[PDB]
């Protein structure tokens, strides 16, 4: 159930730092979406790829960033 992790509030896209560097993506998903996660940095977006059914990926359905 993989994809870009999501801002659980406004459901704006979750922006990662310099693309390529799969360090911040990893870290971030580690310390919010669980100490067993993984991912990498696309074009200013953290695609995380180690996730469970109870990972949602951007946006939210019922409250995307309007």
Compute φ and ψ for 6, nearest 5 degrees.
-135, 145
CA dihedral 20, 46, 52, 30 (to 10 degrees): 80
The CATH number that applies at residue 50 is 3.30.30.10
- Report the domain count for the chain: 1
Q: How was this structure determined?
A: NMR
Which single residue is written with the structure tokens 């946006």? 59
Tokens of 38: 């993984």
CA atoms within 13 A on the CB side of 34: 12
As a whole number of angstroms, the distance between CA 40 and CA 66 comes to: 26
Residue range(s) defining the domain that contains residue 12:
1-66
């Amino acid at each position: 159930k993989e994809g870009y992790l999501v801002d659980k509030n406004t459901g704006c896209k979750y922006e990662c730092l310099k693309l390529g560097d799969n360090d911040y993506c990893l870290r971030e998903c580690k310390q919010q979406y669980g100490k067993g996660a993984g991912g990498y940095c696309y074009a200013f977006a953290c695609w995380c790829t180690h996730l469970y059914e109870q990972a949602i990926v951007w946006p939210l359905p019922n409250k995307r960033c309007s």
